[PDB]
Amino acid sequence: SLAEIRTDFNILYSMMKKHEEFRWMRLRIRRMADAWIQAIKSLAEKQNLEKRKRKKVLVHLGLLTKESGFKIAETAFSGGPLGALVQWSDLITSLYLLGHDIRISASLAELKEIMGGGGVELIYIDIVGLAQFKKTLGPSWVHYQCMLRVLDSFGTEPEFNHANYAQSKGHKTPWGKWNLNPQQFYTMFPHTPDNSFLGFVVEQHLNSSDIHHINEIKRQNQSLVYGKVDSVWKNKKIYLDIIHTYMEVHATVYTKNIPSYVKNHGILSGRDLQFLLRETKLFVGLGLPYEGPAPLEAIANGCAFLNPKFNPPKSSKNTDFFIGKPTLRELTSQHPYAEVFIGRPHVWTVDLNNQEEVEDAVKAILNQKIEPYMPYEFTCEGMLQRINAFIEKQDFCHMWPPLSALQVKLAEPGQSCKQVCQESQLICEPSFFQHLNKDKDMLKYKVTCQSSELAKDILVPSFDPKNKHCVFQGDLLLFSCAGAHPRHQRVCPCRDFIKGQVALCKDCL
Numbered sequence: 100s101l102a103e104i105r106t107d108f109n110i111l112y113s114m115m116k117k118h119e120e121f122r123w124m125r126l127r128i129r130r131m132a133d134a135w136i137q138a139i140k141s142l143a144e145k146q147n148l149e150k151r152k153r154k155k156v157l158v159h160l161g162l163l164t165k166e167s168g169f170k171i172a173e174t175a176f177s178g179g180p181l182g183a184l185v186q187w188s189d190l191i192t193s194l195y196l197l198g199h200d201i202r203i204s205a206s207l208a209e210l211k212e213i214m215g216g217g218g219v220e221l222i223y224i225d226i227v228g229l230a231q232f233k234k235t236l237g238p239s240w241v242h243y244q245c246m247l248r249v250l251d252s253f254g255t256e257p258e259f260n261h262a263n264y265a266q267s268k269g270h271k272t273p274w275g276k277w278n279l280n281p282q283q284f285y286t287m288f289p290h291t292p293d294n295s296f297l298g299f300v301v302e303q304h305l306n307s308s309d310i311h312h313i314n315e316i317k318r319q320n321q322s323l324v325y326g327k328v329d330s331v332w333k334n335k336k337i338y339l340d341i342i343h344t345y346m347e348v349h350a351t352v353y354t355k356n357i358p359s360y361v362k363n364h365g366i367l368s369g370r371d372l373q374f375l376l377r378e379t380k381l382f383v384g385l386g387l388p389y390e391g392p393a394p395l396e397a398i399a400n401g402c403a404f405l406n407p408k409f410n411p412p413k414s415s416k417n418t419d420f421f422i423g424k425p426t427l428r429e430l431t432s433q434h435p436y437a438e439v440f441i442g443r444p445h446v447w448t449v450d451l452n453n454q455e456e457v458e459d460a461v462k463a464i465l466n467q468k469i470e471p472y473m474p475y476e477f478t479c480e481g482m483l484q485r486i487n488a489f490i491e492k493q494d495f496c497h498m499w500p501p502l503s504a505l506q507v508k509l510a511e512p513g514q515s516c517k518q519v520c521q522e523s524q525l526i527c528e529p530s531f532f533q534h535l536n537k538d539k540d541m542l543k544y545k546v547t548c549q550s551s552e553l554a555k556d557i558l559v560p561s562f563d564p565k566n567k568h569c570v571f572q573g574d575l576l577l578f579s580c581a582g583a584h585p586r587h588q589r590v591c592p593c594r595d596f597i598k599g600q601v602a603l604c605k606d607c608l
């Protein structure tokens with residue numbers, strides 16, 4: 100039985116009216132419905148969407164179980180976290196439009212019931228939910244393991260995913276050690292090439308008459324602070340004052356930390372928030388929270404984003420929030436994606452403590468022409484293409500990307516495979532490590548092994564050019580885009596990517 104694209108949302112609304120928790124998600128969908136429907140039709144017109152098998156898909160939202168104790172549903176409308184719920188909403192909508200057979204679960208009862216009656220070919224779950232899956236199913240949970248796609252915002256690096264290696268390194272993460280293929284982890288932003296980038300869609304309501312008259316609509320000296328709760332505002336006053344010299348400063352806050360001059364609007368409904376963004380020249384980052392959606396929404400509406408620079412980068416080594424996350428990734432700014440893949444004039448990444456630099460950025464932004472912008476990968480059509488490619492082409496059970504995409508590179512000592520790929524405008528592709536892990540295979544890529552040994556280490560395969568000595572991976576679950584060798588070179592698998600669609604190679608569709 101073959102999937103048919105859907106262009107009507109009534110079945111979806113009915114499925115989401117089954118739990119109150121889904122209420123917030125259901126409303127965002129309704130606001131974005133016409134965009135979604137334009138996008139599935141446009142994709143079907145550009146690319147052949149026929150001949151897809153209709154999948155039975157479990158979607159288990161562990162974060163919405165009582166049993167998790169997360170209280171996300173509870174605070175959804177009153178200024179709590181929404182990033183995750185944005186992502187889930189967009190994933191469900193995508194699956195529905197592509198014509199799959201979605202069974203949504205927010206409870207142990209439903210999880211048990213859907214798995215109970217068989218058929219399931221694909222499972223979207225979070226880490227909290229994955230623990231529940233293992234516990235509910237007992238030992239046969241491993242039978243489903245290759246169908247798992249695990250929503251994990253900040254990402255999982257190989258050294259935390261391999262249970263035995265993580266313990267040999269003393270890592271106490273409660274989040275790691277599932278022993279999956281790390282490409283099964285689905286992230287919020289393309290920051291972890293050991294994982295896959297899932298993302299979400301950036302909500303925007305600018306017609307092309309809004310964009311032509313955007314200069315009438317936007318008040319040139321209006322800034323808005325990013326930061327829904329009071330805590331995030333501690334010790335920002337110098338920064339805010341420099342901004343307040345040039346611009347009014349507005350906030351949407353659910354207050355001891357906020358100066359008297361700030362103009363508060365409270366927490367706004369999605370529509371009202373979108374209008375406030377459309378009238379705003381400058382969205383002001385305070386440092387927290389890390390890697391959320393809100394800055395991209397502002398950029399889509401023509402705001403510049405002032406992005407706090409982190410020198411040293413923040414990570415588990417230096418920031419409590421990061422301790423125990425199953426990754427050693429370092430953030431160079433509040434929103435590294437915004438910093439690296441968007442940049443000026445939309446994104447000004449600045450040292451909050453450099454008054455001169457802050458002042459120059461504010462005066463610059465004040466003087467910039469308004470240019471609303473969205474990377475393609477965060478549109479409806481671009482997210483549909485990405486997830487459609489993943490469902491049709493990612494298989495961890497029984498060759499994608501195809502070998503023709505492989506471009507081998509040598510990281511220097513002190514540089515990771517992530518880095519050397521990125522420096523040549525490529526991205527690391529962990530599925531190709533298996534093709535560069537033997538004497539023969541090396542010769543090809545213009546490195547000669549005068550002696551090899553095996554090792555079980557994330558930093559290998561490695562090459563010493565002085566000694567012509569090669570080390571190969573002994574444990575194939577330890578292949579790792581993350582990690583730099585302190586003294587040797589790494590042999591690194593890179594691939595190309597489509598403009599504005601970093602998850603997909605040119606030949607991947």
Ligand SMILES: O=c1ccn([C@@H]2O[C@H](COP(=O)(O)OP(=O)(O)O)[C@@H](O)[C@H]2O)c(=O)[nH]1
Pocket residue numbers: 179180181182183185327351365366367368369372388390391392393394396
């Ligand atoms: O007054 C507000 C402020 C924010 N948001 C939304 O809350 C979401 C979460 O954005 P943020 O980057 O703050 O991430 P979080 O930390 O909540 O995951 C975004 O879609 C914002 O538009 C909202 O609905 N009303």
Ligand SMILES: OC[C@H]1O[C@H](O)[C@@H](O)[C@@H](O)[C@@H]1O
Pocket residue numbers: 168169180
């Ligand atoms: O991870 C989601 C959520 O988990 C905890 O249980 C809560 O107390 C929150 O502070 C946190 O954000």
